[PDB]
Design a protein around this ligand. Structure first.
Ligand SMILES: Nc1nc2c(ncn2[C@@H]2O[C@H](COP(=O)(O)OP(=O)(O)OP(=O)(O)O)[C@@H](O)[C@H]2O)c(=O)[nH]1
Ligand SMILES: Nc1ncnc2c1ncn2[C@@H]1O[C@H](COP(=O)(O)OP(=O)(O)CP(=O)(O)O)[C@@H](O)[C@H]1O
Ligand SMILES: Nc1nc2c(ncn2[C@@H]2O[C@H](COP(=O)(O)OP(=O)(O)O)[C@@H](O)[C@H]2O)c(=O)[nH]1
Ligand SMILES: [Ca+2]
Ligand SMILES: [Mg+2]
Ligand SMILES: [Mg+2]
Ligand SMILES: [Mg+2]
Lengths: 427, 336, 54, 437
């Protein structure tokens, strides 16, 4: 069951590269593409993400996309820059100017067919393609605008495949431009309709974690991407290593998505660590379970106590007592049963994987579908409305052919999504 | 932090229990349809016993014994006593009774009824309500109401309290925990009559039936027509030169244990995936010769206002906290 | 009490003991249900491609 | 002699099948290459073991069995397993992508693509039969294949083999080792569609097996391998009468006759004893009375429930090892006076007893200790309905909000089939109650 990976825009390519860097190390693949590991667990399902090449070389099934060559040139000169298939580098020259319209309708529409040629070339090599995963931000132009354009066209050509995304949400605390709420709202509209699974990665939460918890006075994007790569590794563990639970993208979707539009997940992770800062003390299982559920460990700036969990997927990594894990997992549900919907019996599922990530002897990754996620979309909607009520900064969009009505629809659909999440919070 | 659910709102006994539990600050009440509970204070009808004990990571306990209704239904109690060898059919502390269905052992009842007639014995009986000395007066009544009743011999020579020449019945509260220990609450109550007992005319049922309901001369001799044991014992000492323990309570303890031990193998939760306890209300009757008779067993009994605090706290200590411990006794253990 | 129908052999034996006496759709219809469901999938996929075409 | 074909569907069915056929081989003295030295009729014969094994001129003894899964991962381990030579390729059928814990996807979408192939591969086995009795079907309730594809197969078998009997071995969903939240949906759906096509079905609640392994084998966190080696012992006890000389349950039709008076109520409860840990240094061998008494302990049942508060329609005792009728009757007389065993008024209060002198075989290196006598009780009690009650309650909670339903509707299933299935279960629960109280 092969997965085709796509990374779009500056953010998309910067976390996308970091992702391939991290899991390549876990699968024992060096920058050359050669395997140098000591466990056979590493190679059993390496076909999910890697293509097998001459000399038993492994090549990521990854497609790199951008409307400017800057970031992708940095990727190609980065640590694992050479592992990527050079033909899978598809880039324009004009950029998107943090403009959704440019990415979706003009600049990106010019490039999108070239990208789909590569997607198609990769897909036909697959014995049994299960689907796609996209990494991108929603606050810019390329990843947000062209990324959702790609999603729409992939769904057209592969309507029976799963679409998955890692979507970075914009935050004023970590902001490039004022129009990020516009770009994000337009994108969420697209995501609600055309993805089955979306990991909501909030730059607000990533900032707060770095500041409040990791005590980083002034966090960079590099710091923020330490958390993202750690989270991305964890939520894909069940897909990359042998196991019985949530092993493919469809079975994850069937277990996590009770209603088709409500497919926006809160990722969580424990223990939280900063770059370089060495951890010497391994956490106990009770500690991992408590932390991975705490709001301070959520990658989406939402209070889980303000909502209810529809579904939960948990993945413990390392050498530990699987009996202690099940005990602690059952304790959380039994002590805080109110925060789990009673009309989905046994909605918490747990997996365990012997291989821990690098630098930690054990870890836990959390994937929650909570109604509390509405707080994320409400926040975006408020920032959106503040500007839109005065039609501020809209000329950037009307200049590319967009009409005000399209903003109104996007606004309305996100507010509908909010109310849908609220409907089940009071069930 | 233990958890529990409430599925019987009309329960005065366990309304007080849920109160006490919460007041420990170590018990949290959940919604009625929440399955992740430690304790279930269940409903009286169609309690879903089958959905209990299937929650991984949860020790579960319920305040009812599945199958105990065979003891606590009038038609069933008769059948139980008659068919059980441990209680024979010649059980000496249960009034002669028969199961009669509307249009069974109707012929058998007449082979007793007419036997009395030709033998010139007392012939007042009771339908379960109609106290009569003529059979067809009864058989016509049961067929007129609808569903099955029980016909039982009326104790025509009851013990009568003086002052008043009154009739009474004794209510004993029994708690059976998860280990099937049988605990008799040391405080019982005499639910007395206030209008003197009339041996001749049976139909005015105010002096024949001693239900706390019916009689509300109420409050004349006793506050609430409820004589507790300290007074009843003192009366027995002064008026009959004996005690409550010797003259009555030994028979009560004997009857309670015999009844519950008969059905232990059918309802015990010893090796079950869930656990049961239950509070019973045994109703006894004393004749003039100080011979105790069992009248019925109540599966969902209420308590007496004075004793609620003590009994309900008692339930928490030995039935609940015994299973779920927290961070001299008011019961008599009927040993076996 | 009463043991009956005792049968014995080298591998073992069997018997009955009594304690107390007493007191389809066609091939046609199947394919039609499977093919009807297949059309509902085709209609749903068509509505999607129509929507995407818009 | 009449042949029996064993069908293994989905991961659960396949992996349980592997445990059973492994066990069968050890019991009959068949080796991994299929050679059976004790079989002196080379190239054929009509012995009692031939019910489950056919023979080749080369002297190989091969299972009358087909393995089917909509994903190749599990059966591929059979193809390369220690018993790879035992089966031959056309017995092992695999698709490309599985049913994703989706009944509708297993029944309608992917099922339609492979149903004709499977039936053809089954027909090839049936063609090698002189007198086919029918089929033994192994599957889960919770999986998309085990639930979805099974019900479709059972429907067609009733068309293609109308006169033949069909028995089920079914794994009932347990959260402790569950892999999907929608398993109650799949369970109700496959039961509804399979009910009229099944003559007798042995349910195994993974919950009960899980706790027996923990409680009696001292395994802290049982694996599927732990569960399955225990299950195969039960299945072996049940089918031993088809594979050995005897006069009780000698053909499939007799299972219905002896255990199922009412067709819809065809779910007998299995109870097995003794389960003893191999690592247990010191063990006192249990007597006929002790193991027989254990058959009325809920903690030893395949489905946790309380038979005291139900009624029996039938009851078979299947012993293996050092046992004689005299000790059994003495045991039954004692137990009868101690325990609550109510039969329905229109049934005799009795026990059909079967004894095989061969004590139960144990897999070398397994978790089970060798014993001198074991017993499996097959009782048709209305108490097993408690499992339908649990399942339907979970079904009602999710379906009230139509949670996850879109996954099924998206595969071409109508929402109405949910409620049709649930009403069929409501009638089933009512049947059990009419008979049982
Ligand atoms: N006892 C036992 N149960 C199993 C085993 N494998 C899976 N199960 C149970 O079966 C249910 C899931 O069904 P599966 O058989 O795994 O899935 P499937 O039949 O392959 O269907 P799909 O994978 O969706 O196509 C869960 O409740 C599991 O606990 C096994 O080897 N032994
Ligand atoms: N065989 C008998 N002989 C004499 N008096 C009898 C009798 N059976 C019942 N009584 C009297 O009639 C009253 C009826 O009470 P019964 O217990 O029979 O119905 P109930 O279930 O409605 C009352 P509770 O549940 O509070 O005990 C008894 O308390 C007793 O005083
Ligand atoms: N976490 C993270 N967020 C980023 C990064 N680069 C940009 N962003 C965020 O993404 C938005 C800008 O989008 P960007 O990717 O630069 O636009 P694009 O290149 O046209 O797709 C803003 O909300 C930024 O905070 C990065 O490296 N890491
Ligand atoms: Ca032969
Ligand atoms: Mg940028
Ligand atoms: Mg009463
Ligand atoms: Mg499978």
């Amino acid at each position: 069951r092969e997965i085709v990976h796509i990374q779009a825009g500056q953010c998309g390519n910067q976390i996308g590269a970091k992702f391939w860097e991290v899991i390549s190390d876990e699968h024992g693949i060096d920058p050359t593409g050669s395997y140098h590991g000591d466990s056979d667990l590493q190679l059993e399902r390496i076909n999910v993400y890697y293509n097998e090449a001459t000399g038993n070389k492994y090549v990521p099934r990854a497609i790199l996309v951008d409307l400017e060559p800057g970031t992708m040139d940095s990727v190609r000169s980065g640590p694992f820059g050479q592992i990527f298939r050079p033909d899978n580098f598809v880039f324009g020259q004009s950029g998107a100017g943090n403009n959704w319209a440019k990415g979706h309708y003009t600049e990106g529409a010019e490039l999108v067919d070239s990208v789909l040629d590569v997607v198609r070339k990769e897909s036909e090599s697959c014995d049994c393609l299960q689907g796609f995963q996209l990494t991108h931000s929603l606050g810019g132009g390329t990843g947000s605008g062209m990324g959702t354009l790609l999603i729409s066209k992939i769904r057209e050509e592969y309507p029976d495949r799963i679409m998955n995304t890692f979507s970075v949400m914009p935050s004023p605390k970590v902001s490039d431009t004022v129009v990020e709420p516009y770009n994000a709202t337009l994108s969420v509209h697209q995501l609600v309709e055309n993805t089955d699974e979306t990991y909501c990665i909030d730059n607000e939460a990533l900032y707060d974690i770095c500041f409040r918890t990791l005590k980083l006075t002034t966090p960079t994007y590099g710091d923020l991407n330490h958390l993202v790569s750690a989270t991305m590794s964890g939520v894909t563990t069940c897909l990359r290593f042998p196991g019985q639970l949530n092993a493919d993208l469809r079975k994850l979707a069937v277990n996590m998505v009770p209603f088709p539009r409500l497919h926006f997940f809160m990722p969580g992770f424990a223990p939280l660590t900063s770059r370089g800062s060495q951890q010497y003390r391994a956490l106990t299982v009770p500690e991992l379970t408590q932390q991975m559920f705490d709001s301070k460990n959520m990658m989406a700036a939402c209070d889980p106590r303000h909502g209810r969990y529809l579904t939960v997927a948990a993945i413990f990594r390392g050498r530990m007592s699987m009996k202690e894990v099940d005990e602690q997992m059952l304790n959380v549900q039994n002590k805080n049963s109110s925060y789990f919907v009673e009309w989905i019996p046994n909605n918490v599922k747990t997996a365990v994987c012997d291989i821990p990530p690098r630098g930690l002897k054990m870890s836990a990754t959390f994937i929650g579908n909570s109604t509390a996620i509405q707080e994320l979309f409400k926040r975006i909607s408020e920032q959106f409305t503040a500007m839109f009520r005065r039609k501020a900064f809209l000329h950037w969009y009307t200049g590319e052919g967009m009409d005000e009505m399209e903003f109104t629809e996007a606004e309305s659909n996100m507010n509908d999504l909010v109310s849908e999440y609220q409907q089940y919070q009071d069930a | 932090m233990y958890t529990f659910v409430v599925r019987d709102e009309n329960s005065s006994v366990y309304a007080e229990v849920s109160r006490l539990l919460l007041a420990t600050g170590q018990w949290k009440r959940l919604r009625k349809d929440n399955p992740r509970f430690n304790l279930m204070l269940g409903e009286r009808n169609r309690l879903p016993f089958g959905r209990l004990g299937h929650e991984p990571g949860l020790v579960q306990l319920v305040n009812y014994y599945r199958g105990a209704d065979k003891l606590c239904r009038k038609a069933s109690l008769v059948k139980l006593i008659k068919t059980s060898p441990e209680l024979s059919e010649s059980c000496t502390w249960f009034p002669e009774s028969y199961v009669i269905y509307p249009t069974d052992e109707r012929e058998v009842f007449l082979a007793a009824y007419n036997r009395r007639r030709e033998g010139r014995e007392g012939n007042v009986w009771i339908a379960k309500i109609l106290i009569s000395s003529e059979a067809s007066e009864l058989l016509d009544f049961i067929d007129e109401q609808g569903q099955v009743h029980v016909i039982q011999k009326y104790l025509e020579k009851p013990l009568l309290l003086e002052p008043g020449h009154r009739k009474f019945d004794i209510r004993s509260w029994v708690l059976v925990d998860h280990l099937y220990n049988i605990y008799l609450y040391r405080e019982g109550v005499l639910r007395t009559s206030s209008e003197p007992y009339n041996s001749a005319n049976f139909q005015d049922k105010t002096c024949h039936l001693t239900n706390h309901c019916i009689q509300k001369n109420y409050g004349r001799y006793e506050e609430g027509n409820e004589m507790f044991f300290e007074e009843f014992n003192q009366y027995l000492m002064d008026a009959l030169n004996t005690t409550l323990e010797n003259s009555i309570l030994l028979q009560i303890k004997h009857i309670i244990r015999s009844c519950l031990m008969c059905i232990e193998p059918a309802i015990s939760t010893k090796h079950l995936h869930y656990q049961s306890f239950q509070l019973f209300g045994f109703d006894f009757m004393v004749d003039e010769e100080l011979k105790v008779w069992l009248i019925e067993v109540n599966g969902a009994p209420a308590c007496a206002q004075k004793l609620y605090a003590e009994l309900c706290q008692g339930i928490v200590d030995v039935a609940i906290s015994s299973v779920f411990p927290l961070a001299t006794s008011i019961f008599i253990k009927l040993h076996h | 009490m009463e043991v009956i129908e005792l049968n014995k052999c080298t591998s073992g034996q069997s018997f009955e003991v009594i304690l107390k006496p007493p007191s389809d759709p066609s091939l046609e219809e199947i394919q039609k249900k499977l093919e009807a469901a297949e059309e509902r999938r085709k209609y749903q996929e068509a509505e999607l491609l129509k929507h995407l075409a818009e | 002699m009449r042949e029996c074909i064993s069908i293994h569907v989905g991961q659960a069915g396949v992996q349980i099948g592997n445990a059973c056929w492994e066990l069968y081989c050890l019991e009959h003295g068949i080796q991994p290459d299929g050679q059976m030295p004790s079989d002196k009729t080379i190239g054929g014969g009509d012995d009692s073991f031939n019910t489950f094994f056919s023979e080749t001129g080369a002297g190989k003894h091969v299972p009358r069995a087909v393995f089917v899964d909509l994903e190749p991962t599990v059966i591929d381990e059979v193809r390369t397993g220690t018993y790879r030579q035992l089966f031959h390729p056309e017995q092992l059928i695999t698709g490309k992508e599985d049913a994703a814990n989706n009944y509708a996807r297993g029944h309608y979408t992917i099922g339609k693509e492979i149903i004709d192939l499977v039936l053809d591969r089954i027909r090839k086995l049936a063609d090698q039969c002189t007198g086919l009795q029918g089929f033994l079907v192994f599957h889960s309730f919770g999986g998309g294949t085990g639930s979805g594809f099974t019900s479709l197969l059972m429907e067609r078998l009733s068309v293609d083999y109308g006169k033949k009997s069909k028995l089920e071995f079914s794994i009932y969903p347990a959260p402790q080792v569950s892999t999907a939240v929608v398993e109650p949906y799949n369970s109700i759906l496959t039961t509804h569609t399979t009910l009229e096509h099944s003559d007798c079905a042995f349910m195994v609640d993974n919950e009960a097996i899980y706790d027996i392994c923990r409680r009696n084998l001292d395994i802290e966190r049982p694996t599927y391998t732990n569960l399955n080696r225990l299950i195969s012992q039960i299945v072996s006890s049940i089918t031993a009468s088809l594979r050995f000389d005897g006069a009780l349950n000698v053909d499939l039709t007799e299972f219905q006759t002896n255990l199922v008076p009412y067709p819809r109520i065809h779910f007998p409860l299995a109870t097995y004893a003794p389960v003893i840990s191999a690592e247990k240094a010191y063990h006192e061998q249990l007597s006929v009375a002790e193991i027989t008494n254990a058959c009325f302990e809920p903690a030893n049942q395949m489905v946790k429930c309380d038979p005291r508060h139900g009624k029996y329609m039938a009851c078979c005792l299947l012993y293996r090892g050092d046992v004689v009728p005299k000790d059994v009757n003495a045991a039954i007389a004692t137990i009868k006076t101690k325990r609550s065993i109510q039969f329905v008024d229109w049934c005799p209060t009795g026990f059909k007893v079967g004894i095989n002198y061969q004590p139960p075989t144990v897999v070398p290196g397994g978790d089970l200790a060798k014993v001198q006598r074991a017993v499996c009780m097959l009782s048709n009690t209305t108490a097993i309905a408690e499992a339908w009650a649990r399942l339907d309650h979970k079904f009602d909670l999710m379906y009230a909000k139509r949670a996850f339903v879109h996954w099924y509707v998206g595969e071409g299933m109508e929402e109405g089939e949910f409620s049709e299935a649930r009403e069929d279960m409501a009638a089933l629960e009512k049947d059990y109650e009419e008979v049982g109280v």
